[PDB]
Design a protein around this ligand. Structure first.
Ligand code: CLA
Ligand code: CLA
Ligand code: CLA
Ligand code: CLA
Ligand code: CLA
Ligand code: CLA
Ligand code: CLA
Ligand code: CLA
Ligand SMILES: CC(=CC=C/C(C)=C/C=C/C=C(C)\C=C\C=C(C)\C=C\C1=C(C)CCCC1(C)C)/C=C/C1=C(C)CCCC1(C)C
Ligand SMILES: CCCCCCCCCCCCO[C@H]1O[C@H](CO)[C@@H](O[C@H]2O[C@H](CO)[C@@H](O)[C@H](O)[C@H]2O)[C@H](O)[C@H]1O
Ligand SMILES: CC1=C(C/C=C(\C)CCC[C@H](C)CCC[C@@H](C)CCCC(C)C)C(=O)c2ccccc2C1=O
Lengths: 85, 176, 42, 730, 153
C-alpha cells in the first residue's frame, strides 16, 4: 500500500449504517410491530377485512387462537356437518 | 488403557513453548493496542516513499541475520557442555552429562550453591500466566481463524459458494 | 535434545515416508523445471 | 517372554530381538525372518497353544476389513461425485462414456485424460457405479457427498468396535463356543432386514424416481430431498394407497389392479436394465424367507440322524469340532462364497439388474471377469484352508471313525477315479481342436468337426434353452419374453443406441469349449483334491505330519520327494485355475462380440462387433489367435499416444512381470546363495556387508514369488488387453 | 490419572435408567402442557396453519447444549468431595448464613418438621410411567392415518 489523504477525509461510514430507524427486521413484520388487528369488540369473524376471511371460523381457524372456547360448538368430530356436500 | 509416550524429552517440548508463546505476546498486545483512532493516522513516509521500495527480502536477510544468530545460540548453549560422546545419559545425549561443562576450568557457573539455582521462590510468576501464554494464544490464535477467513469479498475461489447471509472479518464484537 | 554421536531410532518402513516425499519433492523440481534432457546451470 | 509380567507391566514391548518359535530370531543376525514376520504373520501354531484368543483376534482383525471396504467406497462415492461426470452422464446416457478419475498434469501425464462425456477430460470406468447410482431417488453431486461421509462414519466407529474387542479385555469361549443361534439372526434379519429394508427404499423413492426418468427431464426438475413421506400422492402414479384393502388378506376387490410388482421378466425399451416394477417384489419375496427361516432353532440333532449302510455313520457327529476349527469353517465357505460369486458372473450378462448395462458392454464384462476371478481365487483357497485343517487344528485325534476317516479309508481311490476322468477329457477335450489344425492345414473340411462338416445340421435348438424361453406357458403365469432374453424363443427389439442380449445360439464351437471347461475344471481339483486328502500321511512319506502343511519338500530320496505337501498342491492348483478362469474369460467376450454385441440401424440389420467370425474358426485354436489374440489386441498395440494408453503402456510391463516369474519359478536355491556370496565377498573388501546375514529365498518363498507374479503378470496383461477392445468400437 | 468408565453388566441401565428420567421431563409437552400451545413442533402440510411459527428462532443453540453440558460433568467431579466449595470470602466473620446443604428435595434438609393435617386420605414407578409418557408423543409426531382416519370410530 501507500497513503495519500486520509485513510480518509470522512471516516468509515454507511457499511453498517442503520441509525434513525435501525429498521428492517425489528419492524418488518411492521405489519406487526403490533400484530394489532380487530374489533374490541366483537361480533364475529374478525380478521376483517384484511386479513380476511374466516374460512371456517369460530374455534376454527382462530388458532391463531380465536379465543375463548364457547358453549361451542366444540369442534369435535361428526360435525361440522361435513358440509361437503 | 493408556499411552506409552512421556517423550522423555517430555522435558524439551516445553521449551519451544516458552518460545512460541511468550512470543505471541509480541502480536497480542501490539495488535489491539494498535491505537484505535490514535488521534489518528497510520502513515509511514520516511525510508519508504522514495528510495525504490524498502524491504521484503532484503527484509528477511537483515531481519533474521539477527534472529539467525540469536535463535541458534538459544538452544545450543541453553546449557549443555560436556558436549560429546559416548554412552547413555538419555535426553538424547546428556552426553554432556555428569560433567556440566568444566572440571575447575573457568566460571561456567552462575551463582553460589554449586549449581545454577536462580533461587527457590519463583514458581509464582511464570508457571501461571506464561504456560498460560501457551494456553492463551491457542484461543486468540484460534481467532486468527475467525479474524479473517472468508477472504473479504474479493474472492470466492472454487465456487461451491454454498449459501448466503452476510459478511465477516474483524475489529471486535459481533452481531450477537 | 540430540547432540553428538548418533541418535534415536525409527520404524520398518519410514522408507514409505522417504520414497513418498523426499523423492516426491523432485516432481517438485520436475515442474519448476517442467522439463529436462540436458539443463542450464547456476 | 517377559518382558516381564505377568502382571506387572503396562510398559509395552518395544525393544529386544525377536519373537516367534523359541530358539527364536536368536541374537545372531539373519534376513529370512523378515519374510518370516510378514508371511505366516497370521497362522496359529504360535501365539498360544490355546484356542481362546485366536477367535478373539479374528473377530477383530476381521472388523478392519468392513472398515476399509468402508474407507474404500467413500473414495468412489466421493470421486463418483465432485469429480463429476455422473450428473452430466444421467441426463445424457446412451451418449456419455463415464469417468470418475482424472490425473493432474504432472510430467508426461494428461494423455491419460481424454474427453469422456458431459464435457470433460478424464480416464474412463469399467466399474458400474454410475449405475447402482441410477437408484438415487433424489440425484445431486454434493448428495453422494453425504452417502460418502455416511461411509466414513461407518468406519472409525465400525473400526472402533475392533478396539472394542481384542485390545479391550475380550469375550471368550461360550460366546462363540456356544454357536447355538448364530445363523438364527444373520439370515433372519439382515439377510432379511436388508433386502427387506432394501425393499423399503426400492419403491418408496427409486422406482418412482426413474419411472418418470425413463423419458427426459433434467434432475431437480424431478426428485426433491424429502418429497417422499406421508405424501402418498405421487405414489399415486405407480399404484393405489390401498384404496380399500387393509393389510393384504382376501376380502379384496380388483376390477382393475394388483399392486406394483405386476411381474416383468424382460427389458425396458429405453432402459433395458430389466424392470424395477419387479425388483421390489423379488427382494420382498426374499427377506420373508430369512424372516421366516432364521427362526430355527436353538444343533447336532439333524446331522446326528440320517445314516445308512455305506453312507456316513460319522455323518452323525460330523464334528463337535465344527464349533472348534475355523480353518475348517473357513475352507467351507470359500468354496461357497467363492463358488457363489461366479454364479453372479452369469445371471449378470444374461440378465442385467441395473439400468444401462449391455449397451454399456465394457462396464459389465470387466465385471463378469473380475467377478469370475474371485469365484476361483477364493476356491483354490477353499481347498488350501481344508489342507490346513486336514493337517492341524484340533488338539489330539478326538474326531474319530466317521464320514472322513471314511473318505480317507478310500483315498488312493476317490482320486484314482478323477484321474482317468481327465485323460478321457483332454483327449476328447483338447486334441479335439488339434484334429482340425492337423486336418484343416492338411485341409479336407469334409472331415473336420466344423459346425457343419461332422453331422449336426443347421440347428442346435432342441434341448432346454428352447424350453426356457417358452416356459411362460406352464404352471408359469407369464409376462412377455422369458426370464433371460438370451433364450431360444421369440423377441428381438432390445435397445436404441447399440444392442443388448438376444438368443445366443450353440452347437459345436460352444459344444467343445464347454467341454474344455470340464477337463479344465476337473484336473484343477484333482491336484487340490488329492492334495488336501493326502495331507498328513502317505506311502511316499508317512512321517509326513511332523512340521506343517507347507514344508519345501521332504528330501532328494524316494526318487523325487519334492513337490508333495499341500501348500504346493495349492501352488500348482493356482497354476491351473489361472487358466480355468483365464480361458473362461477368453470364451465369453469372443462369443459375446462375435455374436450378441453388435448393432441395430434401419430394418435392424444386426452388425456384430464381428459378423460371427466364430462360426468355423474358433474350432481351430489358431483362429483363437487368427480371430482373437492377433485380431483384437491390434487395439492394445495401436493404443499409444491416446487417453487409455495406460493399457498398452501396462501391457508391456506385466507382460514383462509374468516373464520374470519363470526366473522365480524355474530355479534352484543354494544357487543364488552360491551367487549371493561372490557378492558378499566384494562387499567385505570395501567393508560394506555382513551385519544381518544376507540370505537367498526360502525354498518355498521362492515358489511364493513365482505364482503370485505369474498371476499378477499373466493376468493384468489381459486386464489391459481387454480395456482397449470395448472402449473404442465395441 | 486417566479418566474412568466402568462397564459392568449394568452401568448401562443406571445411566440408562437416568437418560430416560431426564427425558421424562424433557417429555415436556404434557408434563408442562403450558409449554407448548404449539411448541412441540420445532419449526404442516396443511397441518395446522389455520412456518411453524412466529417463533423463538436462532443460532446459539449448539453453544447452549454444549456449555451447559459443560456442567453436567461437573456435579460429577466437584462432589467427588473434599469440600471447600464455600470459599466464603477472606475476611468477615459474619457468614453463618448457609442456604441448604446437599439438597435432594425440599432442600438443605427436608425441613419445617411440623406438618400433617391434610394432603390426605420405589421410585422406578416414578420412572416406568413417564416413558409411558415419553415414547407416546414419539408416535404422536407421525400420529396420523390421513388417507382415511380412525377405523375404530
Ligand atoms: C491406536 C491403537 C492401537 C495400539 C496402540 C494397538 C497396540 C497393539 N495391538 Mg491392536 N488394534 C487396534 C488399535 C491399536 N492396537 C485396533 C483399532 C484394532 C482393531 C481394528 C486392533 C486389533 C488387534 C489385534 C487382533 C491384536 C492387536 C494386538 C496389539 C498389540 C500388538 C500391536 C502390533 O504390533 O501390531 C502391528 C499392526 C499394526 C500397527 C497395523 C494394524 C492393522 C490395521 C488395523 C490397519 C492396517 C491395514 C492397512 C490398510 C495396511 C494394508 C494396506 C497397505 C498396502 C498399506 C499392541 C499392544 C495384538 C496382541 O494382542 O498381541 C498378540 C493382536 O493381535 N490389535
Ligand atoms: C477367508 C479367508 C482368508 C483368510 C481370512 C485367510 C487367512 C489366512 N491364510 Mg489364507 N488363503 C485364502 C483366503 C484367506 N486366508 C485364499 C483364497 C487362498 C488361496 C489363494 C489362501 C491361500 C493361503 C495359503 C497358501 C496360506 C494361507 C495362510 C493363511 C493364514 C496366514 C495369513 C498371513 O500371514 O497373511 C499372508 C499375506 C501376506 C504375507 C501378504 C502378501 C500378499 C502378496 C502376495 C500380494 C498379493 C499380490 C497383489 C496384487 C500385490 C499388491 C499390489 C502391489 C503390486 C503393489 C491366515 C490364517 C498361510 C498359512 O500358513 O496358514 C496358517 C498359508 O500360507 N492362505
Ligand atoms: C480328442 C480327440 C481325438 C479324437 C476323439 C479323434 C478322432 C478321430 N480322429 Mg483324430 N487326431 C487327434 C485327436 C483325436 N482324434 C489328434 C491329437 C491328432 C493329431 C495327433 C489327430 C490326427 C488325426 C488324423 C490325421 C486323422 C484323425 C482322424 C480321426 C477320426 C478317425 C478315428 C478312427 O478311425 O479310429 C478308429 C476307432 C476305433 C478303433 C474306435 C474305438 C475307440 C473308442 C471306441 C474308445 C471308446 C472307449 C469305450 C467306448 C469305453 C466304453 C467301455 C465299454 C465296456 C462300453 C476320428 C474322428 C482321421 C480322420 O480323417 O478323421 C476325419 C485322420 O486319420 N485324427
Ligand atoms: C531381464 C531381462 C531380459 C529382459 C530385459 C527381458 C525383457 C522382456 N521380456 Mg523376457 N526373458 C528373458 C530375459 C529378459 N527379458 C529370459 C532369460 C527369458 C527366458 C528365456 C525370457 C522369456 C520371456 C518371455 C516368454 C516373454 C518375455 C517377455 C519380455 C518383455 C515384456 C514386454 C515389455 O517389458 O515392454 C516394455 C515396456 C514397459 C515395461 C513399460 C512399463 C510401464 C509401466 C509398467 C509403468 C512404469 C513402471 C512402474 C514402476 C510400474 C507400476 C508398479 C507400481 C505399483 C510400483 C520384455 C521386453 C514377454 C514378451 O512380451 O514377449 C516375448 C514374454 O512373455 N521374456
Ligand atoms: C533466525 C533464525 C532461525 C533459526 C536459525 C531458528 C532456529 C531455531 N528455532 Mg526458530 N524461528 C524463526 C527463525 C529461526 N529459528 C522464526 C522466523 C520463527 C517464527 C517467528 C521461529 C519460531 C520458533 C519457535 C516457536 C521455536 C523455534 C525454535 C527454534 C530452535 C529449534 C528449531 C527447529 O524447529 O528445529 C529444527 C528441527 C527439525 C526437525 C526441522 C532453533 C534454535 C524452537 C525452540 O526454540 O526449541 C527449543 C521453538 O521454540 N523457532
Ligand atoms: C485387509 C487387511 C488387513 C487388516 C484388516 C489387517 C489387520 C491386522 N493386522 Mg495385518 N497385515 C496385512 C493386511 C491387514 N492386516 C498385510 C497385507 C500384511 C503384510 C504381510 C500384514 C502384516 C501384519 C503383521 C506382521 C501384523 C499384522 C497385525 C494385524 C493386526 C494388528 C492391529 C493393531 O495392532 O493395531 C492397529 C494400528 C493402527 C490402526 C495404526 C496405524 C497404522 C497404519 C498402517 C494405518 C490387525 C488384526 C499384527 C497382528 O499379528 O495382529 C493380528 C502383526 O503385527 N499384520
Ligand atoms: C478406494 C479408494 C482410494 C483410492 C485408490 C483413491 C485414489 C485416489 N484418490 Mg481418493 N479418497 C478415498 C479413497 C481412495 N482414493 C477416500 C475414502 C476419500 C475420502 C477421504 C478420498 C478423498 C480424495 C480426494 C479429495 C482426492 C482424492 C484423490 C485421489 C486420487 C489422487 C491420488 C492420491 O491419493 O495421492 C496423491 C487417486 C486416484 C484426489 C483427486 O481425485 O485428484 C486427481 C483428490 O485429491 N481422494
Ligand atoms: C420395512 C420397511 C419400510 C419402512 C421403514 C417403511 C416405513 C414407512 N412406510 Mg412403508 N412400505 C414398504 C417398506 C417400508 N416402509 C413397502 C415394501 C411397501 C409396499 C409393500 C410400503 C407401502 C407403504 C404405504 C402405502 C405407506 C407406507 C407408509 C410408511 C410410513 C408409515 C407407515 C409404516 O409403514 O410404518 C409405521 C406404522 C404405522 C404408522 C402403523 C413409514 C415411513 C405410509 C406413509 O406414507 O406414512 C404414514 C403409507 O403411505 N408404506
Ligand atoms: C524399470 C522400472 C520399473 C519397471 C516396471 C515394469 C516393467 C513393470 C511393473 C509392473 C507393475 C505392476 C503391474 C504392479 C501393479 C499393479 C496393479 C495395481 C495391478 C492391479 C490389478 C488387479 C486389480 C488384480 C489383477 C489385475 C491388475 C494387474 C490390473 C523402474 C526402475 C527404476 C530405476 C531405473 C531405478 C530407481 C527405481 C525405479 C525408478 C523403479
Ligand atoms: C443374423 C443371421 C440371420 C439369421 C436369423 C434371421 C431370422 C429372423 C429374421 C431377422 C431377425 C432380426 O429381427 C428383426 O427383424 C426385422 C429386421 O428385418 C426388424 O423389423 C422391425 O422393423 C420394422 C419397423 O416397424 C418392422 O418391419 C417390424 O415391425 C420391426 O420389428 C426388427 O428390428 C427385428 O425384429
Ligand atoms: C532369482 C531367484 C532368487 C534370488 C532373489 C532374491 C535374492 C530376491 C531378494 C531381493 C531383495 C527383495 C532385495 C531387497 C533389498 C532392499 C529392500 C534393500 C534396500 C531398501 C530399498 C530402499 C531399496 C532366489 O533367492 C530364489 C530362491 C528360490 C527359488 C527361486 C529363486 C530365484 O529364482
Amino acid at each position: 500500500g501507500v497513503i495519500e489523504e486520509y485513510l480518509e477525509k470522512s471516516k468509515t461510514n454507511k457499511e453498517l449504517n442503520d441509525k434513525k430507524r435501525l429498521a428492517t427486521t425489528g419492524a418488518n413484520f411492521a405489519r406487526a410491530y403490533t400484530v394489532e388487528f380487530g374489533s374490541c369488540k366483537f361480533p364475529e369473524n374478525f380478521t376483517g377485512c384484511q386479513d380476511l376471511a374466516k374460512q371456517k371460523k369460530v374455534p376454527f381457524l382462530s388458532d391463531d387462537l380465536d379465543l375463548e372456547c364457547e358453549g361451542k360448538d366444540k369442534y369435535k368430530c361428526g360435525s361440522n356437518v361435513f358440509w361437503k356436500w | 488403557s493408556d499411552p506409552e509416550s512421556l517423550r522423555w524429552n517430555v522435558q524439551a517440548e516445553l521449551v519451544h513453548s516458552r518460545w512460541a508463546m511468550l512470543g505471541a505476546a509480541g502480536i497480542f498486545i501490539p495488535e489491539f493496542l494498535t491505537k484505535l483512532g490514535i488521534l489518528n493516522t497510520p502513515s509511514w513516509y520516511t525510508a519508504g516513499e522514495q528510495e525504490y521500495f524498502t524491504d521484503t527480502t532484503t527484509l528477511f536477510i537483515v531481519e533474521l541475520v539477527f534472529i539467525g544468530w540469536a535463535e541458534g545460540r538459544r538452544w545450543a548453549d541453553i546449557l549443555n557442555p560436556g558436549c560429546v560422546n559416548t554412552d547413555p545419559i538419555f535426553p538424547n545425549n546428556k552426553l554432556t552429562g555428569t560433567d556440566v561443562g568444566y572440571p575447575g576450568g573457568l566460571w561456567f557457573d552462575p551463582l553460589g550453591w554449586g549449581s545454577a539455582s536462580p533461587q527457590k521462590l519463583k514458581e509464582l510468576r511464570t508457571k501461571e500466566i506464561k504456560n498460560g501464554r501457551l494456553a492463551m494464544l491457542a484461543v486468540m490464535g484460534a481467532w486468527f481463524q475467525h479474524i479473517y477467513t472468508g477472504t473479504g469479498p474479493i474472492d470466492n475461489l472454487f465456487a461451491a459458494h454454498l449459501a448466503d447471509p452476510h459478511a465477516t472479518i474483524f475489529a471486535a464484537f459481533t452481531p450477537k | 535434545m540430540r547432540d553428538f554421536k548418533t541418535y534415536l531410532s525409527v520404524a520398518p518402513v519410514l522408507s514409505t515416508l522417504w520414497f513418498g516425499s523426499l523423492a516426491g519433492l523432485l516432481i517438485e523440481i520436475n515442474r519448476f523445471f517442467p522439463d529436462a534432457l540436458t539443463f542450464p546451470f547456476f | 517372554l517377559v518382558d516381564r509380567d505377568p502382571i506387572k507391566t503396562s510398559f509395552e514391548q518395544w525393544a529386544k530381538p525377536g519373537h516367534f518359535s523359541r530358539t527364536i530370531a536368536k541374537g545372531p543376525d539373519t534376513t529370512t525372518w523378515i519374510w518370516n514376520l510378514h508371511a505366516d504373520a497370521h497362522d496359529f501354531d504360535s501365539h498360544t497353544s490355546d484356542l481362546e484368543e485366536i477367535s478373539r483376534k479374528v473377530f477383530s482383525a476381521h472388523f478392519g476389513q468392513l472398515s476399509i471396504i468402508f474407507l474404500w467406497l467413500s473414495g468412489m462415492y466421493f470421486h463418483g461425485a465432485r469429480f463429476s461426470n455422473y450428473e452430466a452422464w444421467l441426463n445424457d446416457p446412451t451418449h456419455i462414456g463415464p469417468s470418475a478419475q482424472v490425473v493432474w498434469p504432472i510430467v508426461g501425464q494428461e494423455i491419460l485424460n481424454g474427453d469422456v462425456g458431459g464435457g470433460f477430460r478424464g480416464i474412463q470406468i469399467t466399474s458400474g457405479f454410475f449405475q447402482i447410482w441410477r437408484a438415487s431417488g433424489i440425484t445431486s453431486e454434493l448428495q453422494l457427498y453425504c452417502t460418502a461421509i455416511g461411509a466414513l462414519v461407518f468406519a472409525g466407529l465400525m473400526l472402533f468396535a475392533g478396539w472394542f474387542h481384542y485390545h479391550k479385555a475380550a469375550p471368550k469361549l461360550a460366546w462363540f463356543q456356544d454357536v447355538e443361534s448364530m445363523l438364527n439372526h444373520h439370515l433372519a434379519g439382515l439377510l432379511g432386514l436388508g433386502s427387506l429394508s432394501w425393499a423399503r427404499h426400492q419403491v418408496h423413492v427409486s422406482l418412482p424416481i426413474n419411472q418418470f426418468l425413463n423419458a427426459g427431464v433434467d434432475p431437480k426438475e424431478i426428485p426433491l430431498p424429502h418429497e417422499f413421506i406421508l405424501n402418498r400422492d405421487l405414489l399415486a402414479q405407480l399404484y393405489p394407497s390401498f384404496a380399500e384393502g387393509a393389510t393384504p388378506f382376501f376380502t379384496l376387490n380388483w376390477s382393475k389392479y394388483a399392486d406394483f410388482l405386476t411381474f416383468r421378466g424382460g427389458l425396458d425399451p429405453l432402459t433395458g436394465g430389466l424392470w424395477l416394477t419387479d425388483i421390489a417384489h423379488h427382494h420382498l419375496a426374499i427377506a420373508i424367507l430369512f424372516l421366516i427361516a432364521g427362526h430355527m432353532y436353538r444343533i447336532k440333532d439333524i446331522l446326528e440322524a440320517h445314516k445308512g449302510p455305506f453312507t456316513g455313520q460319522g455323518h452323525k457327529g460330523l464334528y463337535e469340532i465344527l464349533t472348534t476349527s475355523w480353518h475348517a469353517q473357513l475352507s467351507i465357505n470359500l468354496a461357497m462364497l467363492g463358488s457363489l460369486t461366479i454364479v453372479v458372473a452369469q445371471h449378470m450378462y444374461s440378465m442385467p439388474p441395473y439400468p444401462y448395462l449391455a449397451t454399456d458392454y465394457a462396464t459389465q464384462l470387466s465385471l463378469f471377469t473380475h467377478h469370475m476371478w474371485i469365484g476361483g481365487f477364493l476356491i483354490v483357497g477353499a481347498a488350501a484352508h481344508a489342507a490346513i485343517f486336514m493337517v492341524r487344528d484340533y488338539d489330539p485325534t478326538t474326531r474319530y471313525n466317521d464320514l472322513l476317516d471314511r473318505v480317507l479309508r478310500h483315498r488312493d481311490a476317490i482320486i484314482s477315479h478323477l484321474n482317468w476322468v481327465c485323460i478321457f477329457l483332454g483327449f476328447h477335450s483338447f486334441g479335439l481342436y488339434i484334429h482340425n489344425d492337423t486336418m484343416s492345414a492338411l485341409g479336407r473340411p469334409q472331415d473336420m468337426f466344423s459346425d457343419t462338416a461332422i453331422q449336426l445340421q443347421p440347428v442346435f435348438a432342441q434341448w432346454i434353452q428352447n424350453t426356457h424361453a417358452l416356459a411362460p406357458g406352464t404352471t408359469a403365469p407369464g409376462a412377455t419374453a422369458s426370464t433371460s432374453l438370451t433364450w431360444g424363443g421369440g423377441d428381438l427389439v432390445a435397445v436404441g443406441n447399440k444392442v443388448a442380449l438376444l438368443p445366443i445360439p450353440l452347437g459345436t464351437a460352444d459344444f467343445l469349449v464347454h467341454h474344455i471347461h470340464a477337463f479344465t475344471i476337473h484336473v484343477t481339483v484333482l491336484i487340490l483334491l488329492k492334495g488336501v486328502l493326502f495331507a498328513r500321511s502317505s506311502r511316499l512319506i508317512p512321517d509326513k505330519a511332523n512340521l506343517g502343511f507347507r514344508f519345501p519338500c521332504d528330501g532328494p530320496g524316494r526318487g523325487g520327494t519334492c513337490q508333495v505337501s499341500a501348500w504346493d498342491h495349492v501352488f500348482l492348483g493356482l497354476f491351473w485355475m489361472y487358466n480355468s478362469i483365464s480361458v473362461v474369460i477368453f470364451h465369453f467376450s469372443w462369443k459375446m462380440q462375435s455374436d450378441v454385441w453388435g448393432t441395430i440401424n434401419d430394418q435392424g440389420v444386426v452388425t456384430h462387433i464381428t459378423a460371427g467370425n466364430f462360426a468355423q474358426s474358433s474350432i481351430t485354436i489358431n483362429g483363437w489367435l487368427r480371430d482373437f489374440l492377433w485380431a483384437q489386441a491390434s487395439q492394445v498395440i495401436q493404443s499409444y499416444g491416446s487417453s487409455l494408453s495406460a493399457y498398452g503402456l501396462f501391457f508391456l510391463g506385466a507382460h514383462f512381470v509374468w516373464a520374470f516369474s519363470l526366473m522365480f519359478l524355474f530355479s534352484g536355491r543354494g544357487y543364488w546363495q552360491e551367487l549371493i556370496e561372490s557378492i558378499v565377498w566384494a562387499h567385505n573388501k570395501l567393508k560394506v556387508a555382513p551385519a544381518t546375514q544376507p540370505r537367498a529365498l526360502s525354498i518355498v518363498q521362492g515358489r511364493a514369488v513365482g505364482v503370485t507374479h505369474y498371476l499378477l503378470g499373466g493376468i493384468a496383461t489381459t486386464w489391459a488387453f481387454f480395456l482397449a477392445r470395448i472402449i473404442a468400437v465395441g | 490419572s486417566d479418566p474412568e468408565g466402568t462397564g459392568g453388566f449394568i452401568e448401562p441401565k443406571w445411566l440408562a435408567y437416568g437418560e430416560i428420567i431426564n427425558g421424562r421431563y424433557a417429555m415436556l409437552g404434557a408434563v408442562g402442557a403450558i409449554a407448548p400451545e404449539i411448541l412441540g413442533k420445532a419449526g404442516w402440510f396443511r397441518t395446522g396453519f389455520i412456518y411453524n411459527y412466529w417463533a423463538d428462532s436462532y443460532t446459539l443453540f449448539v453453544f447452549e447444549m454444549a456449555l451447559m453440558g459443560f456442567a453436567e460433568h461437573r456435579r460429577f467431579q466437584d462432589w467427588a468431595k473434599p469440600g471447600s466449595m464455600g470459599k466464603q470470602y477472606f475476611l468477615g466473620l459474619e457468614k453463618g448464613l448457609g442456604g441448604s446443604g446437599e439438597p435432594a428435595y425440599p432442600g438443605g434438609p427436608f425441613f419445617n418438621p411440623l406438618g400433617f393435617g391434610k394432603d390426605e386420605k420405589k421410585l422406578k414407578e416414578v420412572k416406568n410411567g413417564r416413558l409411558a409418557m415419553l415414547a407416546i408423543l414419539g408416535y404422536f409426531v407421525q400420529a396420523l392415518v390421513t388417507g382415511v382416519g380412525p377405523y375404530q370410530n
